[PDB]
Design a protein around this ligand. Structure first.
Ligand SMILES: [Zn+2]
Ligand SMILES: [Zn+2]
Lengths: 91, 147, 114, 69, 120
RNA sequence: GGAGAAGGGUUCCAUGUGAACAGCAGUUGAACAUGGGUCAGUCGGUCCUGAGAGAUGGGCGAGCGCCGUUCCGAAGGGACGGGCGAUGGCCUCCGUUGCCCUCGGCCGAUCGAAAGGGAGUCGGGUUCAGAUCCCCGAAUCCGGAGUGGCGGAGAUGGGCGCCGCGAGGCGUCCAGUGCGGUAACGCGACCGAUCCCGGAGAAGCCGGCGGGAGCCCCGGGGAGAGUUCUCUUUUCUUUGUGAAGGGCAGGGCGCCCUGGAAUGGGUUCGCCCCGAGAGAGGGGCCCGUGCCUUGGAAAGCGUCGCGGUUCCGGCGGCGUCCGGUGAGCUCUCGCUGGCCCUUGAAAAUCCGGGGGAGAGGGUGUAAAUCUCGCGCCGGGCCGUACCCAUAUCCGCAGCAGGUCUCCAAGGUGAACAGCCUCUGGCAUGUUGGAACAAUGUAGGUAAGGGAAGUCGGCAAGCCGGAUCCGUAACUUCGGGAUAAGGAUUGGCUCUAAGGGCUGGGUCGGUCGCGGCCGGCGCCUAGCAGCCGACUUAGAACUGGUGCGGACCAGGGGAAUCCGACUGU
RNA sequence: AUGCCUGGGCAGGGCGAAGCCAGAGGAAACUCUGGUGGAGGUCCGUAGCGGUCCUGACGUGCAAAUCGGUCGUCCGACCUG
């Protein structure tokens, strides 16, 4: 809040595009541009290369994830369900 | 990244067991697939994310993507950006299965055709507003003259 | 100030029409058309962003004129793969072969027990 | 062109069958001998003057050793 | 004529408010001024560190303060370094005196314990 | 102004004429009549493929033909090795074709870019008109090289038994498709097939920084020169080296080795990096378009002086030098980032790597040289002139219209703004002379009022740059905003602040001011010397209150209706 | 007029978003101050693109749609071979 009160990243859009639309965009704009922690090296190098594809600067590992987030809640849920079904089937 | 397609693709290298060659395929990347990963395809393949196996073998309630509507068409169903099909129930007699499609329709499918376990990578793409004429123009320029 | 013109008929400034200034014994600045900057071969591993060392970065058709020693390095996978990934491949191959031998021994022991 | 550091190497170069006119240029302590060949013009730079004068008499076959002036 | 005008400018002339059409940033970029100041200060700090004038930790702290533009030029940074060095010297002298007193007391107590044990 | 692309096609050059055209004229012209002019392995087409077009197979169609480019195809006429048969040439040895065995994915014939990819030529001279093309001088690329034209690498090692004082020589067993460095990797080569993997070709836009070059600037040396009624160590021009190789500066490395770090450290304009190995040392690789060197001073240029009635591409003396700079303009290279619900091209071609199918001579020789240094021959075909635009193109024309690019000096100035000047270009744009009437077109100025004119402030005018203060209603809190409203701006003389490089190892001993060793001073509050680009603030004095003095250069405020906006 | 391929181009200035640094306050949550940063289908504005107004000039014109001043945009839904 040093410079802007409640816009931050969406301050580049200025007065345009509507306050509610900018507020809705802000979450995605922060999430896609935020660098995550790579769970291969432990470094904060996971950067969104393109839509749904993330790249590690150090590991050079490319992971197919969400469009704006590294891991989506739907992906986590489906992974857990698939693991549970695999364990149930194999016993 | 495939232009004009929300979902990213994945190049996978296999070895053809008839000639000394390395085959390359362009699969639709399921969410969670990373480089340097082994993917197993077939009737005996394990039930893990990023493994294409027939829907008859996998148990009920399995979430799949790039489902083959007919045996041998190399995957046509639920392969847009994050969509997925659900295996409802299997019928061992007549070799048929029931699949809930992302549109909500329940379709009877053959048990022979295969599907890739997991949802398609790149979900939540439509959540972000376009916010511009320019973003939509650039989106449709890579697809077709229809904007 | 001496202003200079193109010495060819390609008036458009394209990639093939790049020039540089050069001073001649006649004491007049002229244009010399420079060749494109070649890049050294990249590692066949596909993971290391850096390019291979010990090899000249020149055009592929100039690689034909270049001698053999300039186009590679004296090592296994020399001039085609980086040393780091080469040694990683060596140790990975050794470890996988040892693990396969161990698995085979365990399977034979299980067969003998059964 | 190629510069030669050894007078013996210069003599071997000048003794070639394809060798031709070898000119001598007195350049005010930078005297040079330039021998023309099929591919390269081989140059030899002699700092000494008496050494160059002695080398002037080392041409075997009666070549075109005519000097430059 | 241009040489004479440039000499007048060097002496300081024809540069008043009424002969300046561009903004202050356009005439002299603040980014370039900051670049010059940062380069000068970092060069001074590195020279001191390599000449053993300041320690690694003090050098790092001064580097961070320079990045935070605590010092407006080289002279003020030098004066602050001198003040820090004087404070460190005083503190080290006091600490050394206290440590010497404590060591002397401990040595005397150890000698007394040895004497008592020998006496039994 | 100097060169191009499309387009024009002799409009290009020289001579002659003034019949016709150049809306006057012309001794002139792009007019007319005569003759001349375009010189290529390296500059481009030619080759490749992109969007795309289009045959065969197949289908349709009354039919000319159409559908389609992998689709209802027996779609490769190719290749190594082996066997058989034959001719040819010292039927020794090789080449050739014929047959048989064997091996073989491709992916559609073909066309498709004179701005995409695409190996390899630069310097000087030269014509009335062409010259990276002609002459001279230096190179380079590709193809051929059977007999292989030469040297060099596979290379001339060890053991055993003898002779010989010794160097050395003979007989026999052998190995020998190279060598060095811990390593990154290096050395002039350093066998190799069908097959397989990979790389280059081959990549968006924008911002920042750094290196290099071209140009500009300053302090000087020279050479030629304008002014000199007074001053001016004067102002103006010049003051260099090619491609191709060798070496070294200078950049970059996500390259290696010793070592393991919190008291966290290193570091940039910003970032960023580190126990998945940071700082500190020693190395390695890439570009080196820059400096020295062969080229190369022979040549070029600036001057001074001659040979020659004339032709004459001549002859000679000298110089072509030493330094510092800058958010300075342009080009290029290299790092670093930001943006995409945009991810930013294919193919021809070349190279590297995994393997040992196969070859070699057997102890002085050979098979191989992804050929190491040389030596020999060839590179065929087409365009090459000029204009490229207020006169060589398209608009009925020498039409104020339209037409795709490169080079980009000095001053003022934020500036590639406007104005003035240097190199270069020209005669004011289908004519001149004489007066300055009315209407006009384009500029201005006007006492007092200041929109009272008019449908309507139409037009004009006002404000305008920069520095320092100040800035409301509303709001989506981002804006409004340069809101509104105030002060300063010239000249000259000073003051203060914002920086780089070098220097103390001084004393003694010793060796040849320089080097080595020992304890010293350890500037650890830094001082001494030498250099350099611009700014910011303040002070005084002064000009007829004039000072963003020409040029550049926002009129604001209160509201209503409509459309979110940007865009079309 | 539109879609695609392959190339070229777009001075100088204002506003100063994310991110980062330093100082101060706090018991915490965190908050203020001074800097760095240069994002924007951002603003003034040149080249370029287009053509509002003077319903100006001309209107058997330079021109079967041109010229002057004033104009909108000029980093992206941009212009163009
Ligand atoms: Zn990682
Ligand atoms: Zn690697």
């Amino acid at each position: 809040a040093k410079r802007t009160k409640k816009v931050g990243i969406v301050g580049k859009y200025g007065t345009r595009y509507g306050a509610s639309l900018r507020k809705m965009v802000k979450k995605i704009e922060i999430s896609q541009h935020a660098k995550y922690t790579c769970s291969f090296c432990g470094k904060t190098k996971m950067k969104r290369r393109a839509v749904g594809i993330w790249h590690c600067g150090s590991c050079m590992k490319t992971v197919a994830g969400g469009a704006w987030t590294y891991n989506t809640t739907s992906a986590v849920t489906v992974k857990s369900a698939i693991r549970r079904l695999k364990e149930l089937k194999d016993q | 990244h495939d232009p004009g397609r929300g979902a990213p693709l994945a190049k996978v290298v296999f070895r053809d067991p008839y000639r000394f060659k390395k085959r390359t395929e362009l699969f639709i990347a399921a969410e969670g697939i990373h480089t340097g990963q082994f993917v197993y395809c077939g009737k005996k393949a394990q039930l893990n994310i990023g493994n294409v196996l027939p829907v008859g073998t996998m148990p009920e309630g399995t979430i799949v993507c790039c489902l083959e509507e007919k045996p041998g068409d190399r995957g046509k169903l639920a392969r847009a950006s994050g969509n997925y099909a659900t295996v409802i129930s299997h019928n061992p007699e007549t070799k048929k299965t029931r699949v809930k499609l992302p549109s909500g329709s329940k379709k009877v499918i053959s048990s022979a055709n295969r599907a890739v376990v997991g949802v398609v990578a790149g979900g939540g793409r439509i959540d972000k507003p376009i916010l511009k004429a320019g973003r939509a123009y650039h989106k449709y320029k890579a697809k077709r003259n229809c904007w | 100030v001496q202003r200079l013109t193109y010495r060819r008929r390609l008036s458009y400034n394209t990639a093939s029409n790049k020039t540089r200034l050069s001073r001649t014994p006649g004491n007049r600045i002229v244009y010399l058309y420079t060749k494109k900057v070649g890049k050294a071969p990249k590692s066949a591993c596909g993971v290391c962003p850096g390019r291979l060392r010990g090899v000249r970065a020149v055009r592929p058709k100039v690689l034909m004129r270049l001698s053999k020693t300039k186009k590679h390095v004296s090592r296994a996978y020399g001039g085609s793969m980086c040393a780091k990934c080469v040694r990683d491949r060596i140790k990975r191959a050794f470890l996988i072969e040892e693990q396969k031998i161990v698995v085979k021994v365990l399977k034979a022991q299980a067969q003998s027990q059964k | 062109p190629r510069k030669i550091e050894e007078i013996k190497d210069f003599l071997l170069t000048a003794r070639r069958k394809d060798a031709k006119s070898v000119k001598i240029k007195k350049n005010k302590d930078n005297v040079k001998f330039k021998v023309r060949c099929s591919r390269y013009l081989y140059t030899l730079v002699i700092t000494d003057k008496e050494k160059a004068e002695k080398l002037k008499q080392s041409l075997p076959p009666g070549l075109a050793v005519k000097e430059l002036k | 004529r241009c040489r004479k005008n440039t000499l007048a400018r060097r002496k300081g002339r024809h540069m008043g408010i009424g002969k300046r059409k561009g903004t202050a940033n356009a005439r002299m970029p603040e980014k370039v001024t900051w670049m010059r100041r940062m380069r000068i200060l970092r060069r001074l700090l590195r020279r001191y560190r390599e000449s053993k004038k300041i320690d690694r930790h003090m050098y790092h702290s001064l580097y961070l303060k320079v990045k935070g533009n605590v010092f407006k030029n080289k002279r003020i940074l030098m004066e602050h370094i001198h003040k820090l060095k004087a404070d460190k010297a005083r503190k080290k002298l006091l600490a050394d005196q206290a440590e010497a007193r404590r060591s002397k007391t401990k040595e005397a107590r150890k000698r007394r314990e040895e004497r008592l044990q020998a006496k039994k």
